[PDB]
Design a protein around this ligand. Structure first.
Ligand SMILES: [Cu+2]
Ligand SMILES: [Cu+2]
Ligand SMILES: [Zn+2]
Ligand SMILES: [Zn+2]
Lengths: 151, 151
């Protein structure tokens, strides 16, 4: 696809709309999240677009290359690692990212997979424990939604 | 994919889970819908997996071949025409269909598109008006949900 959208909902107060657009070899992600705790939050594309068990059935981070977790700027990261989204003190996160590893077509396409906003900030694989290397210690998945094709 | 699932929800009482499985050149659709009015209901895959405006943004019936609307048995039908699903008097529709035109892979794949259950029965393009030929006079889309990959 050329454009996609994810509608995030959870069993909690967090919610939001994420838009994605193909611009060359990169993906531009925009949109907002409200209902969040002030500060930073991991934001990642989880591999399955399965909402049968809420956010739990979306599986792990999408990593077709079997790499360790990292930040959006690391060579060593999961295809779905988009770091953190920051909320202001009213709980609003303004997502603005341009990322060259995710894709709306081909092998690394994220269409049909899950976008998840996490309970805690992402450590970016730099925390010193096993759990940092697979999820960034981001804890709990607050809201998620299957990425689908859009206008 | 080999298996998919659609979770149907609306702003009304209707709800349900539809499962799909690839078996040869055909797709087997199973699952249930509750909260329905007794009788028949159109059931079709709408072309976009866009829930941004509820069920309204799913667009028209998926018809890659530009055909007129029909029944699941007609040569002349939309790829997404699966006819009717019948509720009993407690409002339960038991969906059981095996269909050879829809697909979980390739050109006619329905993964990422919308499954919609309608307010009225589908006339199957045999009603005698323009509207029968594009939607079966099924009226209002009661519930819908993006078709995603499953286990
Ligand atoms: Cu994550
Ligand atoms: Cu329809
Ligand atoms: Zn990761
Ligand atoms: Zn039709």
């Amino acid at each position: 696809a050329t454009k996609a959208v994810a509608v995030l909902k959870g069993d909690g107060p967090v919610q939001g709309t994420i838009h994605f657009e193909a611009k060359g070899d990169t993906v531009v992600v925009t949109g907002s999240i409200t209902g969040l705790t002030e500060g930073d939050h991991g934001f990642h594309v989880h591999q399955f677009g399965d909402n049968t068990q809420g956010c739990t059935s979306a599986g792990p981070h999408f990593n077709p290359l079997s790499k360790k977790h990292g930040g959006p700027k690391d060579e060593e990261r999961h295809v779905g690692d988009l770091g953190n989204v920051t909320a202001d003190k009213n709980g609003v996160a303004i997502v603005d990212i341009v990322d060259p590893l995710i894709s709306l077509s081909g092998e690394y396409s994220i269409i049909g997979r899950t976008m998840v906003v996490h309970e805690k900030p992402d450590d970016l694989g730099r925390g010193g424990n096993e759990e940092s290397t697979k999820t960034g210690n981001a804890g709990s998945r607050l809201a998620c939604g299957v990425i689908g094709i859009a206008k």
